[PDB]
């Protein structure tokens, strides 16, 4: 049985408590079909790991992959709650990956099934399937806020009058560490970065964070569901999400094959109509 690691990230992965009896609430999609739910163990003050209910775009994809490739699995949420960047550890010069990247490389996971950004930095250590989704980075702000994009002066010439940030240890860090100007901006963001996307988004709603830089697939969904939040500027650092596996895995070819077929037969498009574009904000 493959150990699949994922992370809370609506609409790709929803995480909810189980019912008192340990089962998952029966729900239905916008089409009337049952929502497929899997048990995913992970962190819920003292930290506790417990069985929870997971569902969403990536869970449906996982279920399809498992059926197509005939494998069984067990899902768990990344222990440190991060996507993954490489940093020095234990105050030494030894570098290790944190987040889902670290769990895959350590063997705690055999496959990463989540909205994981494909980039050169990560590709040096793991293998990615071809993209199952094409997207990029954008910016989330409160309705009414005026910003041109990543080149806006309030971003390029930072001030305590307009606070912007991202989520720590994600591909946004990787991307910004590739340009001097962006590097400076990231150092400034570092003082405000959040632990999770959900917390940063809530901060924008509460007017505690003026701009949140993150994945457009996630931000456009959030903005489409909350009439008080909007995305702004042109997308930058276009990239795709892919399934992550260790180098020389026996699953890479078949995973990419399944993803290709899903892009060909409408399966991926159907996931978008089920989980991304289906209702107005409320
Ligand atoms: N998809 C992300 C990643 O780190 O994989 C980029 C924002 C989270």
- Residue from 115, 168, 174 to probe ligand 1 pocket by mutation (most atoms less than 8 Å from CB): 115
Gap from CA of 214 to ligand 1 centroid (Å) = 8
CB 138 within 8 A of CB 217: no
Q: How far apart are CA 172 and CA 153, in angstroms?
A: 19
Cα three-residue angle 217-219-223, rounded to 5 degrees: 125
Cα three-residue angle 172-174-180, rounded to 5 degrees: 100
Burial of 279 (0-12, 13-18, 19+ CB in 10 A): exposed
Output the six-digit token pair for 144.
């009414």
Is 117 labelled a binding residue?
yes
Is 115 labelled a binding residue?
yes
Gap from CA of 21 to ligand 1 centroid (Å) = 34
User: Which residue has the least CA distance to atom 8 on ligand 1?
Assistant: 170
Three-state DSSP class for residue 231:
strand
Is 196 labelled a binding residue?
no
Name the experimental technique. X-ray
Q: Is 3.30.470.30 the CATH number for 135-242?
A: no
- Identify residues after which the chain is interrupted (C–N over 2.5 A): 44
Q: How far apart are CA 177 and CA 194, in angstroms?
A: 18
User: Which residue has the least CA distance to atom 6 on ligand 1?
Assistant: 171
Strand partners of residue 67: none
Q: Please report, for the chain, the start and end positions of each structural domain, with discontinuous segments joined by +.
A: 1-134+243-282, 135-242
Q: Which helix (H) or strand (E) holds 220?
A: helix 216-225
The resolution, in angstroms to one decimal, equals 1.5
Task: Please give, one letter per residue, the 3-state secondary structure of 142-190.
Answer: ECCCCCCCCCCHHHHCCECCECEECECCCHHHHHHCCCHHHHHHHHHHH
Alpha carbon dihedral 109, 110, 111, 114, in 10-degree steps, equals -10
Class of domain 1-134+243-282: alpha beta
């Amino acid at each position: 049985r493959l150990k699949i690691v994922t992370i809370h990230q609506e609409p790709f992965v929803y995480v909810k408590p189980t019912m008192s009896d340990g089962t998952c609430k029966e729900e239905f999609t916008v089409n009337g079909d049952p929502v497929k739910k899997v048990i995913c163990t992970g962190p819920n003050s003292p930290r506790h790991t417990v069985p929870q209910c997971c569902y969403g775009f990536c869970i449906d994809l996982l279920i399809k992959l498992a059926r197509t490739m005939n494998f069984t699995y067990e899902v768990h949420l990344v222990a440190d709650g991060k996507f993954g960047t490489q940093e020095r550890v234990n105050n030494s010069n030894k570098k290790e990956w944190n987040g889902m990247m670290g769990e895959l490389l350590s063997g705690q996971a055999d496959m990463i099934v989540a909205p994981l950004t494909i980039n050169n930095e990560r590709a040096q250590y793991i293998e990615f399937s071809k993209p199952f989704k094409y997207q990029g980075l954008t910016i989330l702000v409160k309705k009414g806020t005026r910003i041109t994009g990543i080149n806006d002066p309030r971003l390029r010439n930072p001030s305590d009058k307009f606070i912007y940030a991202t989520v720590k240890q994600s591909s946004v860090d990787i991307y910004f560490r590739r340009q001097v100007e962006l590097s400076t901006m990231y150092r400034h963001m570092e003082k405000h970065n959040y632990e999770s996307a959900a917390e940063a988004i809530q901060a924008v709603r509460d007017n505690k964070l003026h701009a949140f830089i993150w994945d457009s697939a996630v931000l456009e969904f959030e903005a489409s569901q909350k009439c008080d939040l909007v995305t702004t500027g042109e997308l930058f650092f276009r990239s795709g999400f892919g399934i992550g596996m260790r180098k020389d895995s026996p699953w890479k070819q078949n995973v990419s094959l399944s993803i290709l077929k899903s892009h060909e037969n409408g399966f991926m498009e159907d996931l978008d109509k089920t989980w991304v574009r289906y209702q107005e904000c409320d």
